[PDB]
Amino acid sequence: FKIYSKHTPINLVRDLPQGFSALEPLVDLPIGINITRFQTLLALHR
Amino acid sequence: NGVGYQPYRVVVLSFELLHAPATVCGPKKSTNLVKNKCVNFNFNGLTGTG
Ligand SMILES: *[C@@H]1O[C@H](CO)[C@@H](O)[C@H](O)[C@H]1NC(C)=O
Secondary structure: OEEEEOOOOOOOOOOOOOOOOOOEEEEEOOOOOOOOOOOOOOOOOO | OOOOOOOOOOOOOOOOOOOOOOOOOOOOOOOOOOOOOOOEEEEOOEEEEO
16 A cells, blocks of 8 residues: 655645646555545544 | 472464565675675665676
8 A cells, every 4th residue: 555645835726736746655555455445534623 | 489380481472474565574684885896786686797
């Protein structure tokens, strides 16, 4: 299970900019488990 | 107390294996690097000469 990512600033927050940039690898997982669905985690003060 | 009745501490280690890549691997020997001569080399599984 491999992850690739990169970071870049934005001043046109409304939509994705044009251009081209590549993603670099940073970490790998030897987990070997099966993945079929995924979700996201959020945070909020209350 | 008797020798047969003396307390003993015992440590047991067990094995399990999976089709996932192995994670516990002990070290291997390694030598020093040499320059400017014809030599066989093995780097992390990559093999060659020069
Ligand atoms: C993952 O799915 C395969 C078939 O797609 C199955 O053979 C296997 O048992 C499942 N689980 C793991 C841990 O690979």
